[PDB]
Amino acid sequence: WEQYRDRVNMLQQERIRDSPLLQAAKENDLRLLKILLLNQSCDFQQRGAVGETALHVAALYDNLEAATLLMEAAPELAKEPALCEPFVGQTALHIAVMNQNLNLVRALLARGASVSARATGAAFRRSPHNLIYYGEHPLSFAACVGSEEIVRLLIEHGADIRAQDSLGNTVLHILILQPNKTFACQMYNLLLSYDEHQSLELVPNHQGLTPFKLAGVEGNTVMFQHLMQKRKHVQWTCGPLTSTLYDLTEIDSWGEELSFLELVVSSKKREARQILEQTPVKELVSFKWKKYGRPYFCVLASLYILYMICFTTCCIYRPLKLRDDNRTDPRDITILQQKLLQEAYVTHQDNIRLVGELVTVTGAVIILLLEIPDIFRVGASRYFGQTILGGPFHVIIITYASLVLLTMVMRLTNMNGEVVPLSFALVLGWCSVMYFARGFQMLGPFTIMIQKMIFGDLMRFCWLMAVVILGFASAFHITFQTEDPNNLGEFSDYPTALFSTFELFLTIIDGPANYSVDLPFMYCITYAAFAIIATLLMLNLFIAMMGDTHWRVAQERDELWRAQVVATTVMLERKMPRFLWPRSGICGYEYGLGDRWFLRVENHHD
Amino acid sequence: WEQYRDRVNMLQQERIRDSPLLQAAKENDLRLLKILLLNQSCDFQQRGAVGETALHVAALYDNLEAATLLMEAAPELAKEPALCEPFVGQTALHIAVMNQNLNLVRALLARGASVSARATGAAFRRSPHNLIYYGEHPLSFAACVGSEEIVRLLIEHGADIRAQDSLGNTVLHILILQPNKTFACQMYNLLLSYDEHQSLELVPNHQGLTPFKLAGVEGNTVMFQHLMQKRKHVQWTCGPLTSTLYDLTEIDSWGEELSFLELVVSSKKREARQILEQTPVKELVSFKWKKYGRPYFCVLASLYILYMICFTTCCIYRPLKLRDDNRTDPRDITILQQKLLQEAYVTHQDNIRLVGELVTVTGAVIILLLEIPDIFRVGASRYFGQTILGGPFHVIIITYASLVLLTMVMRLTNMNGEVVPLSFALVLGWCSVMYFARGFQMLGPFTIMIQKMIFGDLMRFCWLMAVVILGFASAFHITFQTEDPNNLGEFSDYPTALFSTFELFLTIIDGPANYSVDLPFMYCITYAAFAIIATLLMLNLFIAMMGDTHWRVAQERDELWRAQVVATTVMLERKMPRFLWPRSGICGYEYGLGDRWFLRVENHHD
Ligand SMILES: CC(C)[C@@H](C)/C=C/[C@@H](C)[C@H]1CC[C@H]2C3=CC=C4C[C@@H](O)CC[C@]4(C)[C@H]3CC[C@]12C
Ligand SMILES: CC(C)[C@@H](C)/C=C/[C@@H](C)[C@H]1CC[C@H]2C3=CC=C4C[C@@H](O)CC[C@]4(C)[C@H]3CC[C@]12C
Ligand SMILES: CC(C)[C@@H](C)/C=C/[C@@H](C)[C@H]1CC[C@H]2C3=CC=C4C[C@@H](O)CC[C@]4(C)[C@H]3CC[C@]12C
Ligand SMILES: CC(C)[C@@H](C)/C=C/[C@@H](C)[C@H]1CC[C@H]2C3=CC=C4C[C@@H](O)CC[C@]4(C)[C@H]3CC[C@]12C
C-alpha cells in the first residue's frame, strides 16, 4: 500500500532526524560520533521506525567511516536485523550489498554479519508495489545487483547458493526475473560454478518451475539462449553448414503434467511467446505441427463441420404442426406451433431426425467432457481469457453445449419456445468453427484481428452508439407520437423506435418516407441531424478507426497466430491418445547417446 | 527427407564414436593414431555409416595432422570415396575444399586425389532439402566457397572447367546460382581465364539454359551487370554524355524458340523481374512496347471490344417465342421460351443474328486456337498461374470459348436452358477485357491490385463470411418457420434464407420489417446481433483490411505491372507475323561491325 509506505519512510526519516546517533551516521559527522560513542548513556542498540540500527543508517548512505566507528564501538550491531513489518530481517549486510560498497561488505563480514540472513519483509517480496525483486538473501542481492566480487566474497564466507526465499526461488530464478537480461547471463555463469556435486538448475520453486521453465514463462529470450548454449552439441561444421544437436529433455517434457511448452503458451507475459521463435523450440513445434498437428486439426475441423451440418439439418426439420387456435388478432402471423413429444416421432423422417438429434446430444456431451476438466486444470481466468489458448471459443462452445442440452430438456418436458435456445445455439455453434481458422495461415491472423476489433474498437463504438440511439429513438418516437401509426410505423412504440433507429444507424433499412402524407418537419430536422452525425460521421469514423488500428496491431496479430499454432499442437498432443502422437525427436538409446531425446538442426552459418 | 538425414547423421556420429581410428581422426589424438597405425590388425579402409574413411573424418574436422598421418600410413585413402546414398562419390578432397584448408588440399593432391571426382550424392544435388548447391566437383566447390587460391591449385593439377554435374550445370551456372552475388563475379572473372580456345559461357545445361539465360531466370542482377560489362562498347564519352553499344545477341535471341525475355518473364523467381530494369533490357523492351507493342495491343483491344459487342448484341436479340402452355402456378412468371432451330432463322433480323453468331463462333474457335498450344508450350501450371503472363485471364477466356461452343451445341441440338451458359459466357467475356488494362498505366496496377485482393483478402473474408451466413441463415429460418410466409417472405425456405442473409450481410437489400404485423422478438435479437457482427464489424473490417494490404503491396503492384508490359510485348512478338514485328536494334552488317544486332544507349553520367 502506497500511503502506508509513504508514512513508513516519513517516520523513518523523522526518527533519523530525532536521534543524534542516527543523524551522525547519516551525515557522516565523525566528531559527533566520537562524542556519542564516548558517552555510555547513549544506547548503541537504538532502533528507528523500521527497527533499523545506526549501522543500517550508516550502510544506507554509504558512510564507511561512520559504519566502521559503530562496529568498533559495537560489533554486535552487525548481527542485529530490523524487526518492523516493511523491512523484516534486513541487516546492514543487505544494504551494504545493495549499495555495492565492497569495503563495507568486507568490514561487515569481518565483524560476523550473518551471510544466511533472510530479509522476509514486504519490501523484498515480489509484488507490483515493490519496484525490484532482488530476493531475500545477500547472495541473491549481490547477484541481482551485478557485482561479481561481492558474490565471490560472500561465497568464500559461506553463502549457500541453494537457498530459497518465501516464493521458493533460488538465486538462479531471481537472476532470470531481472529485466537486464545481459549481465544476468554472466552472473548465471558465475553461480553455475561452485555448484559442483541434483544441480541448482534442477531445483523447482513453490510453483514447481525450474529455471528453464521460469525463463520460458517469463519470456527471457537471452537467458533461454544462454541456457541452451549448455544443452547443445555441434556435430560437424563442414563449410558454411553446421549441425547442432539440441537436447529436448527440458523442452519437450515427456511425462511431466505441466510441460515447458504448455507453460509457455499459457503464460500471461507478452514476451513469453518470443520463446517459441528460438532455435530448438521453433523447429520442434514446426515438426510437430506439420507432421502430426495439421492433419489431426484438419480432420477434427471436418468432423466439427459435419456435426454442425447435422445439427443444422435437425434444426431445419424441427417438428412443427398447424396451430390448434384461430388467429383473432390481425397482427398475429403465427401459423405453426411445436409438436408434443408423443406426436413428434411417428414417421421415418422423424426417426432419422431422432438419430441426428441423438448424435447432436452425444456431441454436446463430448464437447462438455472435453472442455470442463481443462477449466479446473489451467484455471478459469486463463482458460477463458487468453487469445493463444482459444479464450472466447471455449465460452462460446460451453454456451452452445449448454443450450443444446437445454433444448433437449425442453423437448423432453414439452416446454414451448425452443426457438430461443435453438437460434442462439445455431449462431454460437457456427461461429465456433472460426476456432479451426487458427490452423490456416490465410484465416488465422484475420480471426485474431476480428477478436481484437470486437473487444477493442467495436465496444468503444457501441458505447457511444448506444447514447446516440437512446437520444434519437426518443426524439423520433415523440415526433411520431401524435401521428397515425399506419402511415409510418417505424416509430410507433419505444422498443420499435429503438430497433428502427438502430437499423437506421447502420443504414440497413431505408429512411422512413411516405410521400403521400404530410410528415412532421421535426422528423425532417431530427433525421437530417441523425443522418449527419450517425450515418456520415460515426459510421465512417468506425471504418477510419478500424483502418488506423489495423496497421498498428498488424505485427502483434501475426505473432499471436504463430503462437496459437503452438498451443493447438500442445493441446492436441495432450488430449489425443499417445498412439496417434509419437514422441518427437531422435532417440538417443538407438545411437548410444543415452536415455535422452535430441533434435538435430542443420543451419547455414556462412 | 528430414528424418532419414537425421538418422544418417546420428548413425555417422555413432560409427565415429564406435571406431577408435575414426574417433582419433575426429579428436586429433596423435598418440592413439600412432598406436593404431602401428598395429597391422587395424583396417586402414574402415568405413563409417555413410561409407566415409578415416581421412574423410580427418578432413571433416580440419585435423591436418591426423590426415597427414593417415595419408603417410595409407596414401590410397586419398583415392577412396564414400559409397553410401546421401554422400555418393564424396572424397576427402571435397571436404578439404569445403572447409578451405589449403594445406590439406595440397597434401591431398600430393597423394593423388582425383581432381575429377564427382560427388553424385543426394546431399550435393540441388534440392529444397539441401541448404547449399555447390555442385559435384571440387573445382565447383572451391568456386562456390570463394577461395581463389584453391581454384588456381586445382586448375594447375588438371581440373576441368568444362565439367557438368547431374543437372548439366557447368561451374559458371553453379557460380550464378549462389546467393552471395558479389564474390561470385570475381570468381566468374577468374574462371573466364584459363578458358582460352565454343566458350564456357555458351555451354547450355540440361534445361538448355546458358549462364546468361540462367542469370536472367534466377534474377541475379549483379551477375547480369557483370556479364553485360563484357558485352558493351563505349563509343564516345564527350563531356557528361556517354554512348554505349550493347550487344543484343543473347538478349533479343532471334530465332531461338525459348528466348531470353520469354524465360525471364515466365520465371517463377520474384527477383527475375528485376532483370527487366537493367540498362540494355529496359531500353530494348521500352522501344519494343512504344514502337510496336502498344499500337498492336490497342487494335487487338478494340477488336476484342467489338467482338464482345457483337456477342452481347446476339445475346440481346436471342430468339424467344411465347409459351405454348398455360401458367397454372401463380408463382410462375415465365412467359417466353426458346425457339426451335427451324423457326429461329426466318426473318432478315434472324439472318443478321446468324451472321453475328457465326462471327462469335469463329472468334471462339480463334481464341481456342490461340490459347491451347501455349498451354503445352509453357506448361499448364505456369500458363494459368503467373500474374505476369496473364494467368487468370487465360482460364477465363478458355471457359468463355468453351461456354460459347457449348451454347452452339445446345442451339444446334435444340437443348433448352441456353441462359445458363450464355450468362456465364457474358460475365466471363466482358470481365476478360480487363486483360487489355495491362496495356495502360492508369489501369494496369489497379487490375493487378484487384487480382491480389481476390486471391488474398476476399477469400479469407469469404471463408468466415460463409460460417456467419450459415449460422444466421439457420437462425433466421427457424425463427420464421412458424410464421406466415406471405407477410415476411425473406426467410421462408432455407435456400431463400441463405440468399436473403447473404444479401443482408452486404446490405444490398433492406432489413425485413413489416410494421403492420407482429414479428417474433427472436428475429429482432438475432438481426440486431447480425447487424452488429456482420454489417458493422466485418463489412467495415474488410475495408480496413483492404486499406491495410493496399499500401503494403503497392510497390509490388507497380513492378508486377511493369513486367506484365514486357510479357505482352514478348508474346505479341512471338504470336504475330514477322512482317508486323521488325527486328529490334541496329544491324551491324550495315556498318561493318559484324553479323550482330546492337542497341545504342546514350546516358548522362555527369
Ligand atoms: C444471436 C445471439 C446469440 C447473440 C448473442 C449473438 C452472438 C454472437 C453472434 C457473437 C457473440 C460473441 C461473438 C464473438 C466472440 C468472439 C469471437 C472471437 C474472434 O476471434 C472471432 C469472432 C468471434 C467468434 C465472435 C463471433 C460472433 C459472436 C459469437
Ligand atoms: C448500440 C449497441 C449497444 C447495440 C448493441 C444496440 C442494441 C440495441 C439498440 C438493440 C439490441 C436488441 C434490440 C431489441 C431486442 C428485441 C426487441 C423486441 C422487439 O419486439 C421490439 C424491439 C426490441 C426491444 C429491440 C430494442 C433495441 C435493442 C435492445
Ligand atoms: C456469374 C458466374 C459466371 C460467376 C462464376 C462469376 C464469375 C466472375 C464474375 C468472376 C470469377 C473470377 C473473377 C476474376 C478472376 C480474376 C481476375 C483477375 C484480376 O486481375 C482482375 C479481375 C478478374 C478478371 C476477376 C473478374 C470477375 C471473375 C471473372
Ligand atoms: C459467403 C461466400 C462463400 C459467398 C460465395 C456466398 C455464397 C452463397 C451464400 C450463395 C452463392 C449463390 C447462392 C445461391 C444460389 C442459387 C440459389 C437458388 C435460388 O433459387 C435459391 C437460393 C440459392 C440456393 C442461393 C443460396 C446461397 C448461395 C449458395
Side-chain angles (χ1 to χ4, degrees), chain A residues 392-393 396 423-424 427-428 431-432 434 447-448 450-452 454-455, chain B residues 472 525-526 529 533:
Chain A
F393 293 98
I396 281 164
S423 314
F424 289 170
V427 169
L428 289 178
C431 288
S432 66
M434 295 184 189
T447 319
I448 302 174
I450 293 177
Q451 181 161 344
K452 287 184 174 305
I454 285 178
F455 302 142
Chain B
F472 281 95
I525 298 176
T526 319
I533 303 301

Side-chain angles (χ1 to χ4, degrees), chain A residues 51-347:
Chain A
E52 58 178 15
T53 66
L55 191 56
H56 286 45
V57 184
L60 187 66
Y61 296 94
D62 269 350
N63 297 327
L64 182 58
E65 325 291 330
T68 48
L69 284 181
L70 283 162
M71 287 180 301
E72 278 172 4
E76 84 285 344
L77 283 176
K79 298 183 177 183
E80 295 293 323
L83 62 80
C84 298
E85 183 50 55
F87 300 101
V88 168
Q90 179 191 41
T91 72
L93 185 57
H94 292 246
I95 324 181
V97 158
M98 276 279 295
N99 291 266
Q100 293 177 335
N101 200 340
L102 177 63
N103 298 329
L104 187 47
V105 176
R106 287 195 186 96
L108 275 165
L109 297 171
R111 294 294 178 176
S114 182
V115 84
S116 64
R118 196 156 154 262
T120 54
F124 313 106
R125 285 188 168 92
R126 192 181 177 190
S127 177
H129 306 150
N130 311 358
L131 297 181
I132 61 171
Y133 173 62
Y134 283 5
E136 289 183 355
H137 292 81
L139 178 59
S140 303
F141 279 13
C144 292
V145 157
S147 53
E148 303 199 4
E149 301 172 334
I150 310 187
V151 163
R152 293 173 188 273
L153 181 70
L154 289 176
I155 286 175
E156 280 167 9
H157 279 70
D160 186 50
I161 39 184
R162 315 175 47 89
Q164 298 185 170
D165 66 324
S166 302
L167 289 185
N169 290 327
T170 68
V171 68
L172 300 188
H173 303 74
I174 317 162
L175 260 181
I176 299 183
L177 283 168
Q178 302 314 304
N180 176 266
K181 305 182 182 64
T182 56
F183 198 81
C185 303
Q186 308 178 209
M187 194 60 64
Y188 205 102
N189 272 337
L190 177 58
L191 291 174
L192 271 178
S193 295
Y194 320 111
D195 206 66
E196 189 262 353
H197 44 65
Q198 185 181 27
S199 60
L200 195 52
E201 289 180 340
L202 302 181
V203 179
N205 60 341
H206 290 176
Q207 299 180 13
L209 264 62
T210 64
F212 200 87
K213 287 183 182 180
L214 177 63
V217 162
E218 296 294 324
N220 204 322
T221 66
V222 193
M223 190 63 62
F224 186 79
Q225 293 177 35
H226 168 257
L227 282 173
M228 297 293 304
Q229 284 316 298
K230 215 182 175 183
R231 292 166 178 84
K232 71 166 68 182
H233 180 253
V234 63
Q235 296 180 154
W236 48 261
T237 189
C238 175
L241 297 187
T242 168
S243 179
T244 47
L245 198 61
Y246 297 95
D247 206 330
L248 300 181
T249 305
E250 309 182 35
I251 299 176
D252 199 12
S253 295
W254 175 269
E256 178 56 46
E257 293 177 350
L258 293 179
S259 61
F260 176 78
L261 304 175
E262 178 185 339
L263 288 177
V264 161
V265 302
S266 66
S267 181
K268 312 238 68 177
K269 303 284 295 188
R270 176 191 170 92
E271 307 93 3
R273 61 172 175 261
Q274 295 167 5
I275 313 294
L276 303 174
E277 306 172 11
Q278 304 304 131
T279 314
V281 176
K282 181 183 181 182
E283 270 87 314
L284 177 62
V285 306
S286 182
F287 164 70
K288 282 185 176 178
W289 178 251
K290 301 261 185 182
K291 189 67 178 178
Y292 305 113
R294 195 192 290 108
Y296 292 162
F297 203 51
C298 283
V299 300
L300 282 186
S302 302
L303 282 181
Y304 191 77
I305 281 180
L306 290 183
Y307 164 73
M308 280 310 299
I309 283 173
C310 290
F311 172 59
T312 304
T313 321
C314 290
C315 287
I316 295 318
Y317 286 87
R318 165 172 64 105
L320 302 172
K321 62 185 298 179
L322 295 175
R323 258 184 57 182
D324 54 334
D325 196 8
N326 295 328
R327 298 161 63 190
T328 66
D329 182 66
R331 297 184 100 258
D332 177 71
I333 56 174
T334 302
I335 60 176
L336 262 53
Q337 64 170 3
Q338 300 177 187
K339 294 182 180 179
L340 302 182
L341 195 64
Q342 307 92 27
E343 51 176 345
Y345 303 99
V346 175
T347 71

Side-chain angles (χ1 to χ4, degrees), chain A residues 356-427:
Chain A
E357 283 170 0
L358 286 179
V359 163
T360 297
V361 166
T362 311
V365 169
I366 284 174
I367 281 165
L368 279 188
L369 285 180
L370 287 183
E371 285 285 334
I372 285 296
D374 297 359
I375 315 169
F376 306 138
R377 230 185 52 89
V378 308
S381 304
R382 300 160 61 94
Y383 196 60
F384 295 149
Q386 296 193 20
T387 312
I388 305 181
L389 299 178
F393 293 98
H394 295 154
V395 195
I396 281 164
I397 216 178
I398 280 173
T399 322
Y400 162 73
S402 306
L403 284 157
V404 165
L405 291 188
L406 176 61
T407 315
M408 181 197 60
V409 168
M410 291 175 62
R411 182 73 62 91
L412 290 179
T413 55
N414 277 0
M415 292 181 59
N416 185 268
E418 297 178 17
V419 198
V420 190
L422 266 191
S423 314
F424 289 170
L426 277 160
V427 169

